[PDB]
Amino acid sequence: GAMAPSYRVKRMDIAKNDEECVVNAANPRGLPGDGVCKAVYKKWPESFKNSATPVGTAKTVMCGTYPVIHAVGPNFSNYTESEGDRELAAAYREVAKEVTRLGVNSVAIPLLSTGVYSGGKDRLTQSLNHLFTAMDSTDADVVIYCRDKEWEKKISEAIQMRT
Numbered sequence: 001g002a003m004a005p006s007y008r009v010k011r012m013d014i015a016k017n018d019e020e021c022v023v024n025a026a027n028p029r030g031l032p033g034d035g036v037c038k039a040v041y042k043k044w045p046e047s048f049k050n051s052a053t054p055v056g057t058a059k060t061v062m063c064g065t066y067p068v069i070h071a072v073g074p075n076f077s078n079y080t081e082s083e084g085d086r087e088l089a090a091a092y093r094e095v096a097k098e099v100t101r102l103g104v105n106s107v108a109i110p111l112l113s114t115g116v117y118s119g120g121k122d123r124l125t126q127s128l129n130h131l132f133t134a135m136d137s138t139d140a141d142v143v144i145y146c147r148d149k150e151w152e153k154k155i156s157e158a159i160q161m162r163t
């Protein structure tokens with residue numbers, strides 16, 4: 001584990017991460033997809049061999065020795081708020097299991113279901129809180145990746161609030 005496990009946030013492409021493994025914001029069919037998923041496909045295409053996995057699950061595939069954790073958050077266009085909420089919480093629990101299993105000291109993680117799977121709603125706080133609930137019991141350095149200037153500020157505030 002990390003000597004003093006931390007949370008950090010950076011505003012940049014997760015494909016350029018400086019961590020021991022990456023979480024993909026995957027689709028259930030292991031398709032190239034859009035957003036983080038598309039960047040992950042361009043950087044680690046080998047990781048998409050048999051990556052298909054059901055909603056609320058995570059499946060790790062190695063690109064070389066570099067672990068890609070395909071986490072499938074729900075598309076809130078398809079789920080009810082209640083059921084989507086359950087599946088989003090579950091995807092993050094499965095990420096925490098996989099990060100523990102791999103024995104990595106760091107992980108790069110996007111906010112699941114905050115892009116084209118958000119159903120046109122701001123789910124920053126909902127997604128980040130499910131991330132904290134899953135990852136708080138792990139000793140991995142967590143680095144959250146985002147693209148929006150205002151989201152970087154709000155994620156940074158939420159991290160600092162608890163320190």
Ligand SMILES: COc1ccc(C2=CCNCC2)cc1
Pocket residue numbers: 114115118120121122123147148151
């Ligand atoms: C209209 O509902 C939404 C949908 C998406 C967003 C985001 C803004 C910045 N990038 C992350 C996702 C915010 C509100």
Ligand SMILES: [Cl-]
Pocket residue numbers: 011012013016
């Ligand atoms: Cl970038």
Ligand SMILES: [Cl-]
Pocket residue numbers: 025035112113114115116117118
């Ligand atoms: Cl998304």
Ligand SMILES: [Cl-]
Pocket residue numbers: 146147148151
């Ligand atoms: Cl963002």
